[PDB]
Design a protein around this motif. Structure first.
Motif, PDB file in Angstrom:
ATOM      1  N   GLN A 127      -9.348  -7.260  -1.694  1.00  0.00           N
ATOM      2  CA  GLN A 127      -9.046  -6.353  -2.797  1.00  0.00           C
ATOM      3  C   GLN A 127     -10.031  -5.191  -2.844  1.00  0.00           C
ATOM      4  O   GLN A 127      -9.634  -4.027  -2.996  1.00  0.00           O
ATOM      5  CB  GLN A 127      -9.064  -7.120  -4.118  1.00  0.00           C
ATOM      6  N   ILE A 128     -11.326  -5.492  -2.726  1.00  0.00           N
ATOM      7  CA  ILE A 128     -12.335  -4.433  -2.765  1.00  0.00           C
ATOM      8  C   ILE A 128     -12.120  -3.459  -1.614  1.00  0.00           C
ATOM      9  O   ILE A 128     -12.129  -2.229  -1.793  1.00  0.00           O
ATOM     10  CB  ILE A 128     -13.750  -5.037  -2.733  1.00  0.00           C
ATOM     11  N   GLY A 182     -14.245 -18.925   1.090  1.00  0.00           N
ATOM     12  CA  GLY A 182     -12.970 -19.561   0.825  1.00  0.00           C
ATOM     13  C   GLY A 182     -11.875 -18.522   0.710  1.00  0.00           C
ATOM     14  O   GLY A 182     -12.084 -17.334   0.937  1.00  0.00           O
ATOM     15  N   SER A 183     -10.685 -19.007   0.352  1.00  0.00           N
ATOM     16  CA  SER A 183      -9.541 -18.114   0.204  1.00  0.00           C
ATOM     17  C   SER A 183      -9.743 -17.136  -0.946  1.00  0.00           C
ATOM     18  O   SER A 183      -9.404 -15.953  -0.830  1.00  0.00           O
ATOM     19  CB  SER A 183      -8.265 -18.928   0.001  1.00  0.00           C
ATOM     20  N   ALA A 184     -10.289 -17.612  -2.068  1.00  0.00           N
ATOM     21  CA  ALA A 184     -10.490 -16.741  -3.222  1.00  0.00           C
ATOM     22  C   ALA A 184     -11.480 -15.627  -2.907  1.00  0.00           C
ATOM     23  O   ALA A 184     -11.232 -14.454  -3.212  1.00  0.00           O
ATOM     24  CB  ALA A 184     -10.965 -17.562  -4.420  1.00  0.00           C
ATOM     25  N   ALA A 185     -12.610 -15.975  -2.291  1.00  0.00           N
ATOM     26  CA  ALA A 185     -13.594 -14.962  -1.928  1.00  0.00           C
ATOM     27  C   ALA A 185     -13.033 -14.002  -0.888  1.00  0.00           C
ATOM     28  O   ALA A 185     -13.283 -12.790  -0.947  1.00  0.00           O
ATOM     29  CB  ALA A 185     -14.868 -15.629  -1.415  1.00  0.00           C
ATOM     30  N   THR A 186     -12.271 -14.526   0.073  1.00  0.00           N
ATOM     31  CA  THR A 186     -11.664 -13.670   1.086  1.00  0.00           C
ATOM     32  C   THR A 186     -10.717 -12.664   0.449  1.00  0.00           C
ATOM     33  O   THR A 186     -10.716 -11.482   0.806  1.00  0.00           O
ATOM     34  CB  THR A 186     -10.930 -14.521   2.121  1.00  0.00           C
ATOM     35  N   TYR A 187      -9.911 -13.112  -0.514  1.00  0.00           N
ATOM     36  CA  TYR A 187      -8.972 -12.200  -1.157  1.00  0.00           C
ATOM     37  C   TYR A 187      -9.689 -11.213  -2.069  1.00  0.00           C
ATOM     38  O   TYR A 187      -9.239 -10.074  -2.232  1.00  0.00           O
ATOM     39  CB  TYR A 187      -7.912 -12.991  -1.919  1.00  0.00           C
ATOM     40  N   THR A 196       0.094  -9.112  -5.494  1.00  0.00           N
ATOM     41  CA  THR A 196      -0.359 -10.442  -5.123  1.00  0.00           C
ATOM     42  C   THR A 196      -0.866 -10.421  -3.688  1.00  0.00           C
ATOM     43  O   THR A 196      -0.526  -9.536  -2.899  1.00  0.00           O
ATOM     44  CB  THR A 196       0.761 -11.475  -5.270  1.00  0.00           C
ATOM     45  N   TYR A 197      -1.692 -11.411  -3.355  1.00  0.00           N
ATOM     46  CA  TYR A 197      -2.354 -11.442  -2.061  1.00  0.00           C
ATOM     47  C   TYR A 197      -1.885 -12.570  -1.155  1.00  0.00           C
ATOM     48  O   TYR A 197      -2.165 -12.527   0.047  1.00  0.00           O
ATOM     49  CB  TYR A 197      -3.875 -11.529  -2.252  1.00  0.00           C
ATOM     50  N   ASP A 198      -1.184 -13.568  -1.684  1.00  0.00           N
ATOM     51  CA  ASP A 198      -0.600 -14.586  -0.825  1.00  0.00           C
ATOM     52  C   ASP A 198       0.588 -14.008  -0.069  1.00  0.00           C
ATOM     53  O   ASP A 198       1.425 -13.302  -0.638  1.00  0.00           O
ATOM     54  CB  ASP A 198      -0.168 -15.801  -1.645  1.00  0.00           C
ATOM     55  N   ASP A 199       0.656 -14.305   1.228  1.00  0.00           N
ATOM     56  CA  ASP A 199       1.705 -13.777   2.086  1.00  0.00           C
ATOM     57  C   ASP A 199       2.912 -14.693   2.203  1.00  0.00           C
ATOM     58  O   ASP A 199       3.833 -14.377   2.963  1.00  0.00           O
ATOM     59  CB  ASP A 199       1.149 -13.492   3.487  1.00  0.00           C
ATOM     60  N   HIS A 207       3.105  -5.425  -1.580  1.00  0.00           N
ATOM     61  CA  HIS A 207       1.964  -5.999  -0.890  1.00  0.00           C
ATOM     62  C   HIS A 207       0.742  -5.100  -1.057  1.00  0.00           C
ATOM     63  O   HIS A 207       0.851  -3.893  -1.284  1.00  0.00           O
ATOM     64  CB  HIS A 207       2.287  -6.193   0.590  1.00  0.00           C
ATOM     65  N   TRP A 208      -0.435  -5.704  -0.946  1.00  0.00           N
ATOM     66  CA  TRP A 208      -1.670  -4.948  -1.145  1.00  0.00           C
ATOM     67  C   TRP A 208      -1.955  -3.962  -0.029  1.00  0.00           C
ATOM     68  O   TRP A 208      -3.026  -3.347  -0.048  1.00  0.00           O
ATOM     69  CB  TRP A 208      -2.851  -5.905  -1.306  1.00  0.00           C
ATOM     70  N   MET A 209      -1.053  -3.783   0.937  1.00  0.00           N
ATOM     71  CA  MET A 209      -1.239  -2.819   2.009  1.00  0.00           C
ATOM     72  C   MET A 209      -0.199  -1.712   2.027  1.00  0.00           C
ATOM     73  O   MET A 209      -0.338  -0.779   2.823  1.00  0.00           O
ATOM     74  CB  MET A 209      -1.213  -3.522   3.374  1.00  0.00           C
ATOM     75  N   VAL A 210       0.831  -1.789   1.185  1.00  0.00           N
ATOM     76  CA  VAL A 210       1.934  -0.835   1.260  1.00  0.00           C
ATOM     77  C   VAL A 210       1.458   0.567   0.903  1.00  0.00           C
ATOM     78  O   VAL A 210       1.759   1.542   1.602  1.00  0.00           O
ATOM     79  CB  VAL A 210       3.087  -1.284   0.347  1.00  0.00           C
ATOM     80  N   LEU A 211       0.719   0.688  -0.197  1.00  0.00           N
ATOM     81  CA  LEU A 211       0.343   2.009  -0.697  1.00  0.00           C
ATOM     82  C   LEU A 211      -0.559   2.782   0.259  1.00  0.00           C
ATOM     83  O   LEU A 211      -0.275   3.968   0.510  1.00  0.00           O
ATOM     84  CB  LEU A 211      -0.290   1.859  -2.085  1.00  0.00           C
ATOM     85  N   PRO A 212      -1.650   2.218   0.798  1.00  0.00           N
ATOM     86  CA  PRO A 212      -2.463   3.004   1.742  1.00  0.00           C
ATOM     87  C   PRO A 212      -1.702   3.441   2.980  1.00  0.00           C
ATOM     88  O   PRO A 212      -1.919   4.555   3.473  1.00  0.00           O
ATOM     89  CB  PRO A 212      -3.614   2.050   2.090  1.00  0.00           C
ATOM     90  N   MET A 213      -0.812   2.594   3.501  1.00  0.00           N
ATOM     91  CA  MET A 213      -0.016   2.986   4.659  1.00  0.00           C
ATOM     92  C   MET A 213       0.963   4.097   4.306  1.00  0.00           C
ATOM     93  O   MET A 213       1.173   5.022   5.098  1.00  0.00           O
ATOM     94  CB  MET A 213       0.742   1.785   5.219  1.00  0.00           C
ATOM     95  N   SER A 214       1.584   4.015   3.129  1.00  0.00           N
ATOM     96  CA  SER A 214       2.640   4.961   2.791  1.00  0.00           C
ATOM     97  C   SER A 214       2.077   6.317   2.387  1.00  0.00           C
ATOM     98  O   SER A 214       2.743   7.345   2.566  1.00  0.00           O
ATOM     99  CB  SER A 214       3.511   4.390   1.675  1.00  0.00           C
TER     100      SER A 214
END
Length: 726
Positions: free
Chosen positions: A552-553, A543-548, A395-398, A615-622
């Motif tokens: 994602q991309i 908007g929020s949808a386009a930003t997310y 999910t992308y909402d924090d 979170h959508w950032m965990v995998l690239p960092m890890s």
């Protein structure tokens, strides 16, 4: 005939230690603390070329209202339905917000005008919301200051009894996320040091040795912090909460691992019967290159982030690499110097066990005797984690990743108590022409466009000039009305060249179905403008949808690029050091297999136990950290194998297992626990990253290093060192 470098590091140990301490102290004292520097040098989380950010900025520029891309929503919630007092308070608050032009750039007053008052008010009538475009792009320090100023203006005033104002929004969420991460960094550091002290006392069973390792770790961490903060303060690079927290944790873990390697090799030399000077020289000759290569591997893997697209990863890249380089420089120069100075006094660094571990010898004999079965079992254990792939989602909402008491979370809670998430995340779409659209035919075409947008599935409301609240109001007498003129001012550009539609999706636009709705909205607008004088019009959608969707991309592309670059660079470094293609390939492949188990364990821990998706950032960092550290451990094992191979391939493997059994195990446990100690952070994303890295390194230490690599080496035999002949 001692080598010049260790001889210099030993003879001038005291000046080297003093110089390192002085440099680190100067770096820390001259420049502010790392938290303050990170707060000042925070960067926007959206790329400058992101379609959503560009669309919002274009809308702001065309309408001559703002030049930013960040908007926070102020929600008035009341115990009773809002009325005259609430309206007067809202008007005063709006006037005060518009007064502060430094932070607030625009206030989209919709509850004030009777034309759109029902749109901004809840169905029960006990709440309302107003959007405020604030200075600065989402994420950077200016945006955080603007969010704080808006919150202060809204909350700190005379409010009607039972009426409270909350400043929610994506920008507020990002500001609170940064604040929580910076606050929890201190607790992370404290818990990490406590865990390290406990682990070192368990490993060495000597208070003096633990104090020495802690001193070296403190030196390395302080140097990394000082240089990172120094460079950030002078605007060399931007910083983020993730960047600072990972810099601190990785510096601590890397310094501890290097100290453990050096001290373990020195104690092994002592157990061999060598004198303290000879033990020090043997330790250096046997671990200096390994430590240097491991540090270069970690630094390069972190630097691979610099070639991403999302600003967070790119801004995290360079500081991590610099900090790792500082830690390595401290470990290879101040490390041996401290070891020599300390070992010159009493029985300080001398081992206490003075005995071998029969467990590691038994494991080595078993691995040599039955390599195929052990390798198969290890591969199966590594690939079991792939079962998490079907159930994996993000999910992308924090909001889920922040504490409930956080002001952004409180605002979201109030808004959802009175509104829907779709209204709190509206999507803006501007259609811009080069002519004036203030003629009845153009308004008919605009209404047609709005109908086309509404026909798309999952499109609840389409606010525009023809549909102020989504319900259509066309003789020129309608134009003559003042309310129509106000609606034109609200939803059309001052010169009339552009018209903006506010689209509220059915359900929640922050989903895959939301992205499909965005694409279908673009297609529908393109179809509508066909055959009309609007054919040449340009369409922007933000908007929020386009930003997310953009996030994602970018996340997918960054993950792919980071994984590929880290693999290639680590393989190159291992090939250069070991001087063997097959050995480096084996190391990289084993760590790659360990990555699947790491991912599976992380997903099982967070999704199916805690209940919070990764979170959508965990995998690239890890990924980078896991690859680097696993490669370092396999490199230690392979280097000791190369040293001991003169007595035979299998005998060499057994001797390498015995020699580098306890040291690398302790280092891996320490690194995994230091990474897992990040879970204490209030920010759940950092905790997820730390726990993922810790689980991955635990699996790599227990399975990959102990079983997979020696089994592969035994099976390959002489071919393990191809192309060089053995």
């Amino acid at each position: 005939p001692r080598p010049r470098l260790p001889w210099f590091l030993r003879t001038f140990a005291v000046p080297i230690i003093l110089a390192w301490v002085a440099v680190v102290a100067i770096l820390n004292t001259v420049v502010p603390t790392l938290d303050e520097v990170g707060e000042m040098r925070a960067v926007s989380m959206a790329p400058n070329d992101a379609p959503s950010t560009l669309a919002i900025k274009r809308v702001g520029q065309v309408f001559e209202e703002y030049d930013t891309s960040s908007s926070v929503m102020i929600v008035l919630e009341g115990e009773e339905p809002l009325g005259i007092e609430a309206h007067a308070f809202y008007d005063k608050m709006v006037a005060d917000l518009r007064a502060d032009t430094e932070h607030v750039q625009h206030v989209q007053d919709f509850w004030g005008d009777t034309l759109t008052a029902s749109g901004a008010q809840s169905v029960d009538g006990k709440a309302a919301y107003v959007q405020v475009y604030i200075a600065g792009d989402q994420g950077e320090s200016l945006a955080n200051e603007s969010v704080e100023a808006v919150r202060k203006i809204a909350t700190e005033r005379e409010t009607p009894s039972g009426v409270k104002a909350y400043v929610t929004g994506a920008a507020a969420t990002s500001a609170d996320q940064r604040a929580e991460g910076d606050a929890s960094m201190k607790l992370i550091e404290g818990v990490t040091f406590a865990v390290i002290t406990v682990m070192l006392l368990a490993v060495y069973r000597s208070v003096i040795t633990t104090l020495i390792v802690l001193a070296m770790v403190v030196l390395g961490l302080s140097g990394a912090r000082g240089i990172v903060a120094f460079l950030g303060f002078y605007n060399v690079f931007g910083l983020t909460t993730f960047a600072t927290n990972m810099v601190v944790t990785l510096a601590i873990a890397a310094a501890t691992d290097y100290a453990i390697f050096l001290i373990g090799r020195y104690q092994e030399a002592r157990r061999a019967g060598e004198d303290r000077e000879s033990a020090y020289y043997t330790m250096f000759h046997g671990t200096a290159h390994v430590v240097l290569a491991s540090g270069l591997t970690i630094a390069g893997a972190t630097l691979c982030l610099h070639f991403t697209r999302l600003p967070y990863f790119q801004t995290m890249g360079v500081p991590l690499a610099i900090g790792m380089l500082i830690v390595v420089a401290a470990a290879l120069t101040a490390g041996p110097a401290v070891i020599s100075v300390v070992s010159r006094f009493g029985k300080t660094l001398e081992p206490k066990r003075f005995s071998r571990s029969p467990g590691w010898h038994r494991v080595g004999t078993a691995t040599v005797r039955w390599p195929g079965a052990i390798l198969v079992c290890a591969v199966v254990a590594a690939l079991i984690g792939l079962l998490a792939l079907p159930g994996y989602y993000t999910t992308y909402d924090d909001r889920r990743y922040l504490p409930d008491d956080v002001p952004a979370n409180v605002g979201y809670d109030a808004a959802f108590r009175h509104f829907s998430q779709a209204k709190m995340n509206p999507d803006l779409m501007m259609v811009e022409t080069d002519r004036d659209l203030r003629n009845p035919a153009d308004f008919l075409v605009i209404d047609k466009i709005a109908k086309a947008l509404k026909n798309v599935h999952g499109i609840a409301q389409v606010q525009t000039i023809t549909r102020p609240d989504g319900d259509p109001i066309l003789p020129p007498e309608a134009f003559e009305t003042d309310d129509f003129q106000r609606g034109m001012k609200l939803f059309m550009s001052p010169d009339g060249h552009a018209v903006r539609f506010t689209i509220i999706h059915q359900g929640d636009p922050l989903t895959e179905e939301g992205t499909a709705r965005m694409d279908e909205l673009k297609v529908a607008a393109a179809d509508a403008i066909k055959g009309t004088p609007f054919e040449g019009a340009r369409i922007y959608l933000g908007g929020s949808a386009a930003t997310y969707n953009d996030m994602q991309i970018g996340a997918d592309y960054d993950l792919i690029i980071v994984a590929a670059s880290a693999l290639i660079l680590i393989f190159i470094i291992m090939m250069v050091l070991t001087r063997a293609v097959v050995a480096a390939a084996v190391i990289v492949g084993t760590v790659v297999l360990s990555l699947a188990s790491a991912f599976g364990l992380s997903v099982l821990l967070w999704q199916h136990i805690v209940g919070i998706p990764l979170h959508w950032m965990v995998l690239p960092m890890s990924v980078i950290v896991l690859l680097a550290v696993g490669a370092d451990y396999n490199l230690l094992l392979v280097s000791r194998m190369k040293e001991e191979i003169h007595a035979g391939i299998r005998t060499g493997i057994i001797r390498a297992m015995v020699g580098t059994g306890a040291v690398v195990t302790a280092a891996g446990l320490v690194f995994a626990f230091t990474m897992a100690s990040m879970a204490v952070s209030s920010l759940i994303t950092i905790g997820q990253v730390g726990t993922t890295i810790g689980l991955g390194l635990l699996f790599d230490t227990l399975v990959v290093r102990s079983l997979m690599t020696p089994s592969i080496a035994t099976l390959l035999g002489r071919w393990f060192w191809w192309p060089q002949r053995v």
